[PDB]
Amino acid sequence: SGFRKMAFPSGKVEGCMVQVTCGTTTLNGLWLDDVVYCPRHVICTSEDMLNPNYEDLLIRKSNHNFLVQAGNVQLRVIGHSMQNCVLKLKVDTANPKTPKYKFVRIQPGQTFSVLACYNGSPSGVYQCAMRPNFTIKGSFLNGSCGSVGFNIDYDCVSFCYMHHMELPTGVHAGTDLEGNFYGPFVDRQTAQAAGTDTTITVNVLAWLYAAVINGDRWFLNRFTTTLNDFNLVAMKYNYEPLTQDHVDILGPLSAQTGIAVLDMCASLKELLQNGMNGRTILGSALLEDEFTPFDVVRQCSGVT
Amino acid sequence: SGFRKMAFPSGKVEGCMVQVTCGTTTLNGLWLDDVVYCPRHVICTSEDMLNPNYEDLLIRKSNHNFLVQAGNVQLRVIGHSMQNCVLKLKVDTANPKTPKYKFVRIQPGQTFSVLACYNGSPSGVYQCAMRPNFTIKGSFLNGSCGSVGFNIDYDCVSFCYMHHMELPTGVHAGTDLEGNFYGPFVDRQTAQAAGTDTTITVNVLAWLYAAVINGDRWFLNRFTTTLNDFNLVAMKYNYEPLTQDHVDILGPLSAQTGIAVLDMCASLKELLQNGMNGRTILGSALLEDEFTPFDVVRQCSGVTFQ
Numbered sequence: 001s002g003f004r005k006m007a008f009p010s011g012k013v014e015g016c017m018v019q020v021t022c023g024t025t026t027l028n029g030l031w032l033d034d035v036v037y038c039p040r041h042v043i044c045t046s047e048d049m050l051n052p053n054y055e056d057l058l059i060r061k062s063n064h065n066f067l068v069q070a071g072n073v074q075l076r077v078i079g080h081s082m083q084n085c086v087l088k089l090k091v092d093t094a095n096p097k098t099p100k101y102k103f104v105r106i107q108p109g110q111t112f113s114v115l116a117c118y119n120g121s122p123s124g125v126y127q128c129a130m131r132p133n134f135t136i137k138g139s140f141l142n143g144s145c146g147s148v149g150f151n152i153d154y155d156c157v158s159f160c161y162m163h164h165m166e167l168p169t170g171v172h173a174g175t176d177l178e179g180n181f182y183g184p185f186v187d188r189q190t191a192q193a194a195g196t197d198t199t200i201t202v203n204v205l206a207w208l209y210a211a212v213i214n215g216d217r218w219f220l221n222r223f224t225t226t227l228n229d230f231n232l233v234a235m236k237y238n239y240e241p242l243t244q245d246h247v248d249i250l251g252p253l254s255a256q257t258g259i260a261v262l263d264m265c266a267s268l269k270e271l272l273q274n275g276m277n278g279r280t281i282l283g284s285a286l287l288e289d290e291f292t293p294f295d296v297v298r299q300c301s302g303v304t
Numbered sequence: 305s306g307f308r309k310m311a312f313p314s315g316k317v318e319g320c321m322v323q324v325t326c327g328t329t330t331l332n333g334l335w336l337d338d339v340v341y342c343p344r345h346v347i348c349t350s351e352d353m354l355n356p357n358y359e360d361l362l363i364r365k366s367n368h369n370f371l372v373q374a375g376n377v378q379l380r381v382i383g384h385s386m387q388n389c390v391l392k393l394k395v396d397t398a399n400p401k402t403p404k405y406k407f408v409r410i411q412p413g414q415t416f417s418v419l420a421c422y423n424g425s426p427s428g429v430y431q432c433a434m435r436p437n438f439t440i441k442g443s444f445l446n447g448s449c450g451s452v453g454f455n456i457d458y459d460c461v462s463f464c465y466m467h468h469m470e471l472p473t474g475v476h477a478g479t480d481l482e483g484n485f486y487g488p489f490v491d492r493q494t495a496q497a498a499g500t501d502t503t504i505t506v507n508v509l510a511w512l513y514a515a516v517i518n519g520d521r522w523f524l525n526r527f528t529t530t531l532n533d534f535n536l537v538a539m540k541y542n543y544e545p546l547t548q549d550h551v552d553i554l555g556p557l558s559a560q561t562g563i564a565v566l567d568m569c570a571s572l573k574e575l576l577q578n579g580m581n582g583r584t585i586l587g588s589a590l591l592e593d594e595f596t597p598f599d600v601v602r603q604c605s606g607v608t609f610q
């Protein structure tokens with residue numbers, strides 16, 4: 001029993017984290033085979049960052065300007081290039097600890113594990129979701145840039161996030177490993193903000209199913225609803241629309257508990273309209289939307 | 305900025321997890337140098353569990369009755385002994401991935417990382433606290449016994465918890481790595497139940513300090529309190545007493561934020577009296593008691609967002 005926000009075991013990723021220094025900036029890089037990936041903003045000073053011409057800044061640097069440290073050992077950079085907003089530093093040594101991996105771009109609503117690192121050294125691991133507004137609610141201090149997010153899908157690590165910056169509201173923005181930002185953000189000092197966010201409906205439903213599986217049932221009721229009427233309510237409470245795809249994706253959880261999706265939707269309607277009346281669900285007083293259906297299934301089955 | 309329940313990186317522990325089988329029972333073990341530690345109940349049948357005589361069950365086993373699998377490789381058991389409620393299986397091979405480590409027995413209120421494992425293979429990692437009633441609020445299915453809890457301060461792993469069982473309320477009980485149970489629990493199917501739990505006051509305070517460090521002051525007030533009046537009130541909400549040790553331990557968080565401990569105590573009093581009135585603190589609508597002072601200092605900036 002029990003239900004906890006749970007990260008993937010981080011060991012396969014820990015063996016890929018390195019320190020990258022350029023001038024007076026130190027941040028983290030990801031060392032896979034003979035390439036180290038890191039945010040291209042590592043080459044910028046404060047002044048550069050106001051209006052950077054990355055092409056022009058990079059051509060002025062030599063290989064030997066990039067100091068890359070894997071634990072105690074220096075790696076030698078033998079090439080550098082840019083792909084979108086990430087820098088690729090070719091090094092002389094292949095990482096002997098490179099796991100089987102892929103670069104994937106995730107969708108809003110999907111969760112992943114973050115390995116927070118400072119000076120190329122892993123510090124902590126937690127679970128995040130890509131918010132509808134394409135930010136993440138992370139925990140990152142200065143020096144954390146280049147930390148990555150990942151899922152593990154067999155023995156294969158799927159890297160999906162590299163950290164680039166913090167927005168004024170204290171939430172976080174970054175790229176996929178091909179260097180494309182999640183969201184309408186840029187790696188320069190200009191005014192940028194998180195857009196208004198919404199709640200990830202399908203995930204709240206998943207969590208309601210988790211709660212039932214774990215014996216927390218007080219919010220169930222005799223009523224059912226339709227997709228259209230439910231989505232009228234969702235819109236009103238700043239919830240993402242529920243689609244037929246979401247209903248399909250919730251099928252396994254529905255079958256296991258005997259609660260049809262639209263039956264659970266009637267519970268959620270009531271919670272949104274009436275609140276919780278001083279009660280909690282899985283120890284929370286708010287509705288939790290950072291567990292996916294697959295997250296719930298994985299934790300309430302035991303896959304390893 | 306931000307604030308999250310954050311576990312230690314699990315890789316140093318992942319390289320120590322193995323599968324142990326005895327008869328039809330499979331669970332997890334912890335492979336350090338040439339010893340595999342696991343719960344002694346691996347030798348029991350379900351019938352045995354009502355009144356097991358572990359000494360008598362164990363004397364009937366040979367080395368070769370214990371099957372230990374490290375990933376793909378079988379290890380050879382060459383010795384066994386029981387210490388308290390753990391079995392130590394001596395094996396032929398030293399773990400080449402053994403980290404620097406020690407065993408520590410923790411106190412109620414201390415937090416640690418759990419690596420939940422099934423069939424000797426890691427499944428996930430999360431943060432837990434030793435509750436005042438000596439249970440943990442974990443996430444564990446059948447097959448999870450032998451999963452361990454740890455901290456990693458510097459490069460040294462401190463093992464503090466091995467999982468043994470689930471209590472009827474759905475909370476979890478286990479031992480230190482010397483095989484002593486936390487709490488009055490036994491590895492026996494009896495009527496045993498977790499005592500009524502309380503909130504870990506010092507940790508709630510720590511978290512209030514975290515919220516200040518991160519730029520939130522709405523819950524502060526102009527009042528102060530004596531330690532004794534605070535404790536008189538707190539006990540009426542099922543909060544653990546705050547001791548002078550706890551006040552000492554909160555000193556650095558007090559210095560960084562400019563808010564005296566007993567002034568933060570007054571804020572908590574008011575929060576308990578009033579609740580939150582639709583507001584959140586660090587994204588929670590409840591008061592959070594699973595972050596220690598040390599946890600807050602580790603995660604938060606040393607510069608308060610004033």
Ligand SMILES: *C(=N)c1ncn(-c2ncnc3nc(SC)sc23)n1
Binds near residue numbers: 028144145190
């Ligand atoms: C990542 N290691 C990092 N530390 C500090 N910063 C940072 N500080 C100030 N401005 C700023 N702008 C960025 S992109 C628009 S990243 C950054 N990053």
Ligand SMILES: *C(=N)c1ncn(-c2ncnc3nc(SC)sc23)n1
Binds near residue numbers: 353
């Ligand atoms: C740990 N690997 C595990 N799986 C299943 N059980 C278990 N099941 C039923 N009863 C029971 N009692 C125990 S100690 C009193 S452990 C256990 N454990």
Ligand code: NA
Binds near residue numbers: 223224264
């Ligand atoms: Na219903």
